[PDB]
């Protein structure tokens, strides 16, 4: 059927995403955002047939700010998938204010995850805009701008095309399908 490649014609396989997800995860994560805090939360799941099935919201520990949620325990997320046999598909995060997009920082963060997993991606949910996205780096032209960015600050410019929303339903498809969530903190 409906099947997606990056920029450089590596196919990417489908990552199947629970309709529910985005919702619970606010819900989860609404005293932070109540507060103007971000959180973040991570995607994860299986690989079967071919296709990746997000199966899991793991909430790790993290430091939230008004614009940053960095993970402060990857110990204890890395050991919880390793028991459950999870992968790591993407992440989400909260922007209690602002628009929709994918920030300096995120898209220094996201590069982690995708260099990792060609299919990763970044759920952005904009709750005061009632607007969400669904973003990934341009591969490879994003990812080698992220690589090479040595400019200094947190939010700092970048220029040119880095990253783009992703392919659905070929790259993403939400579905009916079942939602565990997990706290770590
Ligand atoms: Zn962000
Ligand atoms: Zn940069």
């Known amino acids: 059927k409906i099947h997606a490649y990056t920029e450089g014609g590596k196919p990417l396989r489908t990552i199947y995403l629970p309709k529910l997800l985005k919702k619970v995860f606010l819900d989860v994560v609404k005293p932070n955002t109540k507060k103007n805090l971000e959180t973040c939360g991570i995607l994860c799941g ?54 929709c997009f994918m920030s300096s920082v995120d898209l220094h963060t996201h590069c982690s995850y995708q260099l990792m997993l060609p299919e990763a991606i970044a759920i952005v949910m904009a709750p005061s805009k009632n607007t969400s996205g669904i973003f990934r780096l341009l591969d490879p032209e994003g990812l080698q701008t992220i690589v090479k960015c040595r400019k200094p600050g947190l939010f700092h410019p970048h220029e040119g095309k880095v990253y783009t929303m992703v392919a659905q339903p070929g790259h993403v498809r939400e579905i009916n399908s079942k939602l565990q969530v997990v706290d770590l903190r």
């Not at 079967?48 to 940053?68: C, G, K, M, W, Y």
């Open 46 to 99: 299986k690989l079967r047939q071919n296709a990746f099935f997000i199966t899991h919201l793991v909430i790790p520990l993290q430091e939230a700010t008004s614009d940053t949620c960095g993970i402060t325990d990857e110990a204890s997320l890395f050991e919880f998938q390793d028991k459950h046999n999870l992968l790591t598909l993407g992440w989400i995060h909260t922007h209690p204010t602002q628009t």
